[PDB]
Amino acid sequence: MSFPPQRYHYFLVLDFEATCDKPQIHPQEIIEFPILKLNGRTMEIESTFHMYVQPVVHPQLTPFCTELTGIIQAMVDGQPSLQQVLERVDEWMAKEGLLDPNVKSIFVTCGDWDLKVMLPGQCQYLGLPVADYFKQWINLKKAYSFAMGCWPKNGLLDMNKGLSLQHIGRPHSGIDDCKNIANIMKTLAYRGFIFKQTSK
Ligand SMILES: Nc1ccn([C@@H]2O[C@H](COP(=O)(O)O)[C@@H](O)[C@H]2O)c(=O)n1
Ligand SMILES: [Mg+2]
Incomplete structure (x- = not known):
């Protein structure tokens, strides 16, 4: 069943970029905030x-x-x-x-870091409440692991490799990372995968 009915009317693809350094800066702060709204059926x-x-x-x-x-x-x-x-x-x-x-x-999101660690951690630092729609999400790596039966090693790069997809844009660009997530999701849906919340 190509592009089956999905459980959501829309998917919101998000991929933060944050201040960083080597060794890692502390605290990190969000510097790029992208959201791609995907049609729930067609991606x-x-x-x-x-x-x-x-x-x-x-x-x-x-x-x-x-x-x-x-x-x-x-x-x-x-x-x-x-x-x-x-x-x-x-x-x-x-x-x-x-x-x-x-x-x-x-x-x-690609991983749990964005909404399990980064956003709640900075919001707590700033004394800001986290909107309720940020509290549930799908970890694409976990979803991919059910759709393909295997654990990707290096995130979006290895998921595109597994699906024979060309990488979109620049790695570690928030907006470009979002487009790759959306492209991976579209292919998983083509293969018949039904997405499910993974966050606990
Ligand atoms: N090698 C790396 C990869 C990511 N990072 C941090 O993690 C954030 C999220 O990683 P991505 O760009 O992979 O989404 C980066 O914006 C950066 O702050 C890092 O500090 N060093
Ligand atoms: Mg990113």
Whole structure:
């Protein structure tokens, strides 16, 4: 059954980028906040939220961070901070119609880190409540492991390799990582996979 009925009207693909260094910076702060809204049945991209975020605790991006993500200082200077971006997300959700209880959506991330560690950790640091729609998600690696029967070693790169897909854009670009997640999801749906919440 190619592209079977799914349990959600929409999938929200998210992949943060955060301040970093070697050794790792502390604390890390979200600097890129992308969301791709996918049609629940076809996995086609229908809307995009994308904002760079101004870090505050460590406001200057390290050379490693800019080299890893491609995000330069001018992309985060003058941006809203996480608190305001989270308010922009809520407005975006409202306009998309995703705040209707009868519209079922779920976030999809590559790994658990984004919504199990990064966002709650920074929100706790800032004293900000985490919106309830951030508290359930699908770990694509776990989903892939049920669809393909195997554990990918290196995230999106190895999942594209397993599915014979060309990598979209630049690795460690948040928006480009989201497009790869969406492309992997589309192929898994073509193979007949029905996505399920994995977060506990
Ligand atoms: N080698 C790496 C890979 C990721 N990271 C951190 O983890 C974040 C999320 O990783 P991805 O770019 O793989 O999504 C990065 O924005 C960066 O802060 C890192 O600091 N060193
Ligand atoms: Mg990323």
